[PDB]
Design a protein around this ligand. Structure first.
Ligand SMILES: NC(=O)N[C@@H](CC(=O)O)C(=O)O
Ligand SMILES: NC(=O)N[C@@H](CC(=O)O)C(=O)O
Ligand SMILES: [Zn+2]
Ligand SMILES: [Zn+2]
Ligand SMILES: [Zn+2]
Ligand SMILES: [Zn+2]
Ligand SMILES: [Zn+2]
Ligand SMILES: [Zn+2]
Lengths: 362, 362
């Protein structure tokens, strides 16, 4: 007896194309998405070249249209030079991403004044999302209030962060947030097993108190999103390991396991992987699209999942319950029991659909 | 220059069929919906016969399929006799409606124990909505906690109510709510003009402080819903006036006027008339469905709107800015500039669509 779910949406993935295609490309990353029950992804802009101008966005659009197997939207990235220059292409993007801390990116903003300039110039009806850790969450919330608009906080990982966001929501401030599976299912207790290279990620893994605070404050979490951040094992275990975990293929099984344990309901899961991503990012429905899962199947995560070119996973050895059996995307079987059945290029840019534009005042 | 909106959803309407068809029927009420930019309605169960058993639901389903011009879902109503008896038809309904105070209904529950029995027996994954005023909001929230599930509060009208719900949300409790336009745009100050018959409504009109508290706490309001409650003028001005206002044709123009005044954003409006109704009630998308509005057109609400058989309105004389120009429903023009162009029976029961069933654990 399978359970039918709507097409799930991951609003935070790194697909590495252009420029990092040994780690992942659109074809392999969207295969990973479909195998994880994800039919729409929003791809981050920290590629090479980074997606920080109209020519880079145009390149990325064609690469994604040619390689993606599921539907997608592409983020633009804020830089120290492009505030006030993105107005003609802003509506074609998922949103604007701000990198406000040190991580796998060159998109460094050196001054809060640059954050203000982006909040002032980016169209006010379009999404802004931020990599903002610890006190940076409070700082970017202040910039959002000064400019009288909303902000979405990426991968919240700490008790400090979720309680700050909780207090802001209690005051009626327009802030939403997402949490990634590794900050719900891994902690400091796992760093001995992982080692210092594999264990590198931003935000770093939290304490058991951080993990418990996120679960206790589930009502504050608007979205789950993988922050699928693939790097090869050689890179993770070399002299200067880049931060990040692959996660598209393990997100839904981990969360289904939590549903089976009673840690959250199926509705809680569908709000955070379908309805709230749609409404925060104004992402369109996908016609004739659904995911069939087997909630009874018990298995152990192996040393690598089938599709991501990362070819490793920090969840190796975890016992899970629940698996994706079949995905249908816009009327075509896209995935069955380990086989992807739509080719590279089947996926489309949802911001080009009439129903996928963000409504705005004239 | 028209603005394209998604198909809007009203989760609280009274269409009066069966049994009150001089007030409204499915054909006239859904014409009123389309003229108000509403493409999906959830119809309340306080008809004659009331929708409190499988035979009554079957009758109402066929009447709606034959008469509705937009898509719909039908609520079941809780009674003093039907707890534990609705399990086989529960999934086919919009949800379960509880009448917990005196209003235009015979569906009186005399004891909180009957509320508990409904919360215990109604399937836990399906919506429950309540007419619950003043302290009854706190009481039904307590029943929801004792039974460990969510509840949706209909037509919140008072400072007392919205602050109670705000405090519950701050504690992480699963409660959502809706507000009707008359509790945002009318107050005690209007009772002299309306008179004591026309002015009868439940919840009654609030003070200026109540209205101001709802606007100040917009962040707490999940949905707008009309509580379209048509009665004829003869009935409203006779010896025993029934409570309620018609509202489908005036809701969106009033709210568009508020957007033009800066009282809330277009996004705020679309969360509350589209995305949050979808996610609270698990209502499906409508393919090739959208609403075109003219935000510039200034007009004054007349003594009756064109379609509702109520043939009166409490908003007569209000100056509004914004109007519905065109509605397309599932690929067909449904309304243009005052003309409805889909016949009775064009509308469908969204709970019969594969994408319209509420997901549940096996
Ligand atoms: N999270 C990470 O550790 N790495 C991400 C970047 C990000 O989300 O900061 C990546 O692109 O590798
Ligand atoms: N609100 C009203 O004043 N009347 C509604 C019932 C309701 O929503 O209580 C009706 O059905 O007439
Ligand atoms: Zn990040
Ligand atoms: Zn993010
Ligand atoms: Zn990231
Ligand atoms: Zn009511
Ligand atoms: Zn209601
Ligand atoms: Zn009502």
């Amino acid at each position: 007896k399978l359970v039918r779910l709507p097409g799930l949406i991951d609003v935070h993935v790194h697909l590495r194309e252009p420029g990092g295609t040994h780690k992942e490309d659109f074809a392999s990353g969207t295969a990973a998405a479909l195998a994880g029950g994800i039919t729409m992804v929003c791809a981050m802009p920290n590629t090479r070249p980074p997606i920080i101008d109209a020519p880079a966005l145009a390149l990325a659009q064609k690469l994604a249209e040619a390689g993606a197997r599921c539907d997608f939207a592409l983020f633009l990235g804020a830089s120290s030079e492009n505030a006030g220059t993105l107005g003609t292409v802003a509506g074609s993007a998922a949103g604007l991403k701000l990198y406000l801390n040190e991580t796998f990116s060159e998109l460094r903003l050196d001054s809060v004044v640059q954050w203000m300039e982006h909040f002032e110039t980016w169209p006010s009806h379009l999404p802004i999302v931020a990599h903002a850790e610890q006190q940076t969450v409070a700082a970017v919330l202040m910039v959002a209030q000064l400019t009288q608009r909303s902000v979405h906080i990426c991968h919240v990982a700490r008790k400090e962060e979720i309680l700050l966001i909780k207090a802001a929501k209690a005051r009626g401030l327009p802030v939403t947030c997402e949490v990634a599976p590794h900050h719900l299912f891994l902690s400091h207790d796992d760093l001995e097993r992982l080692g210092p290279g594999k264990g590198e990620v931003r935000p770093e893994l939290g304490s058991r108190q951080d993990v418990e605070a996120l679960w206790e404050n589930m009502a504050v979490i608007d979205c789950f999103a993988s922050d699928h951040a693939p790097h090869t094992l050689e890179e993770k275990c070399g002299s200067r390991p880049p931060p990040g975990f692959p996660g598209l293929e393990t997100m839904l099984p981990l969360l289904l396991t939590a549903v089976s344990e009673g840690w959250l309901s199926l509705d809680d899961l569908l709000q955070r992987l379908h309805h709230n991503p749609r409404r925060i990012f104004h992402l369109p429905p996908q016609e004739d699209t659904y995911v069939e899962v087997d909630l009874e199947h018990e298995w152990t995560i192996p040393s690598h999942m089938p599709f991501s070119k990362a070819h490793w996973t920090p969840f190796e050895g975890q016992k899970v319950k629940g698996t994706v059996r079949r995905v249908v995307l816009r009327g075509e079987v896209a995935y069955i029991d380990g086989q992807v059945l739509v080719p590279p290029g089947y996926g489309q840019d949802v911001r080009k659909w009439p129903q996928g534009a963000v409504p705005q005042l004239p």
